[PDB]
Design a protein around this nucleic acid. Sequence first.
RNA 1: CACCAACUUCCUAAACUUAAAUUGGGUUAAUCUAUAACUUUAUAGAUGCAACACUGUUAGUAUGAGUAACAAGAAUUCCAAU
RNA 2: AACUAAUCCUAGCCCUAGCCCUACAAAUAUAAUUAUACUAUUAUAUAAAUCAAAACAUUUAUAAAAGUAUUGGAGAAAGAAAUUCGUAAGGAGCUAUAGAACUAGUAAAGGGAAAGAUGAAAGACUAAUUAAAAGUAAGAACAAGCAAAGAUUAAACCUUGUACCUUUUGCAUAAUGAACUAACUAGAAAACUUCUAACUAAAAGAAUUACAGCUAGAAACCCCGAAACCAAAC
Lengths: 242, 32, 198, 93
Amino acid sequence: PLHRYPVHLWQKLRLRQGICARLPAHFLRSLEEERTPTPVHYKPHGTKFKINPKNGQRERVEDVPIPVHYPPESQQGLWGGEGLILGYRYANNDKLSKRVKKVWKPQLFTRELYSEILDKKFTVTVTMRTLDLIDEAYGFDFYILKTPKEDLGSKFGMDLKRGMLLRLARQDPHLHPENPERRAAIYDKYRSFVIPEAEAEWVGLTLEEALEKQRLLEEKDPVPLFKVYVEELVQRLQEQVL
Amino acid sequence: YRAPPPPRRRPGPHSPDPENLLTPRWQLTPRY
Amino acid sequence: YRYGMSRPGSIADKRKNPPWSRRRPVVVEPISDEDWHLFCGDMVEILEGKDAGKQGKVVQVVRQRNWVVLEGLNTHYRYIGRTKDHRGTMIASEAPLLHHQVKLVDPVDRKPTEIQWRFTEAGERVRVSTRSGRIIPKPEFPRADGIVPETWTDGPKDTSVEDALERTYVPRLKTLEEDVMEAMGIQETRRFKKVYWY
Amino acid sequence: AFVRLTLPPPKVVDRWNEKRALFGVYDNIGILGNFEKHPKELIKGPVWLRGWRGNELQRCVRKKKFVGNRMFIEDLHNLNKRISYLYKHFNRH
RNA sequence: CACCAACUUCCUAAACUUAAAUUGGGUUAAUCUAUAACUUUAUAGAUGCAACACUGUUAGUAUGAGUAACAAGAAUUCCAAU
RNA sequence: AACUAAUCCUAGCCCUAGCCCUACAAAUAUAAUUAUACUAUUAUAUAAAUCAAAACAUUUAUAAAAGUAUUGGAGAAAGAAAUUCGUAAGGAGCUAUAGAACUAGUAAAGGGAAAGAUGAAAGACUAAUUAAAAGUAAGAACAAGCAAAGAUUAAACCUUGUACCUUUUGCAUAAUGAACUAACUAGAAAACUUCUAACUAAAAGAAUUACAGCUAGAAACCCCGAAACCAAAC
């Protein structure tokens, strides 16, 4: 036969049914929403018009994004949107020259950054672009919190964001231990990102982790039918007394 | 036998429901 | 597999339906349990057949073929005891009657009255005649083994009637294994060590 | 070869049944209906060929487009291979 | 000092002129549909519609041929005997 | 009325429509199916090539605009858009060599079959039906001869006559192929024209052509067979 829904809608149906529906609304919104990462290696067409070939007249234009590969190591590091470009090159930037298989490597680094919220210095893989963003963000903690997941391009950074958001949300004394006065300043300094504790927990969680977490939340030990009947019997007897 | 009634189409404006999965995208455009 | 007068799985049935037989199947109009109204012991009148118009009592019903068998009716003749020494003795052999070939009989008035199924006060389904409405009670049939329950006399290893009907269970929060321990005084103080189920 | 030794049962067919009796009715829907509904709109069948006809390659290609996403993976691969043979036969021979 | 022998030719009835790729035109077996017919037919619309031959495929049965070919120690009183 | 045989109708299939979906015990991944410790535990790369370009090398598809521009060893071919437009169980299919390979995935990866037939009742002794295939029997043969023909009173005698298909050349005493019976077994496209009609300076039920055109219909070009080549498992 023929499937009523196309294959791509199968993923949508799965998300709309089962434990996926029972997932927290705040987390579901974060997963559902998609934000484009900031372009770094390609620019969209400046002009919106160009000459159509067949008619020889001005026409609307379209944009072809350059392919950029972001390795999982970026998800374990803090890259500022830089990525590996895999493809072919024409030597000397002229079409008349030979085609050479080329892998374009942005300069990668491992560096240490201080987090005021976590009161710890983290040594992580980073690029020069990220370092400028951190300075522009007015602090490493700001960059993690301010930058969105796609622009951040780091699962660990999102995981760091999850920890930072929860730390801000709970006003946990873990921040700057033995310095309550200093702790308040950090919370006040990063007060903008204070959010409900429930939302902060699910920030950056992977789909497999989220499904297991929701399953663990909803898993409950079997009820002894003796207790269930006791509660039912008391309710009926209590109603009878009325 | 008596012939079946001639087919009659539904008249009047019909507004597609955006949330419905079945409805095609072009029917939800501002041009539509 | 074509159902026949021979009981399924019998030697005659095996010959009738051997493993390699792929005969053109005979189609039998499905009849619902509610729709079916013919049961063994029911007095019915043969609409058509050799003995059409003769009322008889059902003795076998092959519902798969919609067949009702009346003893001593729809009878052709065959020889019993055919052997080398003796030719054999002619006997009565019944043939199956399809459901449409018979109709139920109203007890007071003997006629092939069409019937409709309806419940009673007790809730038991009973056939009711469409015309001259009346209740056709379910006929009484002897037990297949031939044993009349009351007439039966207990043989060896047979519990007496009262013993079977006696109730000794007392509702309590103990299983059979636990109850057996109390009666026979089994006591075990050893304990299994922690076991990780997985 | 050998032939049947039994005659088939006689069969009688009614030529005035509603389907035969009413065959072709409303075929003038457009001319008698102000052309609001074209007779092509009355076609019921496979989606890719409702109101449309073409050669085998065109029919196969149109079939792929209409139900390609809703077709089985195995069928889609087989259809792709079948299309290749049809394309070469018509477009190169 | 002739006769025989070709559809050459004549004669009665008819006929109206003599290789093979290729090209124009008229029919037809079979199956199904539409509508008919009613011992098996008609008018239309159709097609898995006609095989002595593809190193073609399956099944049956011949021929070679009842031919090539094949085999166990003795006696008795007996194959779980001497 | 003969032996061998033959006979039959459903097992089921096929294509669309509709519909997505959200449905014993015991033993087991150890060495699977070993009742309890060992030893930590695990899939998946552009899809390619074949192929087309008669080789091969860049390259080679897999609603209207329109198969047009563009792209391309400018060659095999590839091929947008702008801008318009888009509501909503059946078979002129098969019926046991056919239809799914199938009665069946049954009888190292992997490959993969063969076949069945009474009647309402067999708790009626299991059915009949057919000068019906080849093969045989009933009933061997009788100088002379591609086996027949003309004949005839007469089967044989008399008279006449270099098996068939394909291929050579319009020729074979060449050369290929055939024990026989039954089934199965190979021509498919519309750009333009003629023909058949509708309407006409207009014609086509949107996207087309026009100083008699335009619309519709009909009209066409097979099958089997290598040595090879590559991917992924075993």
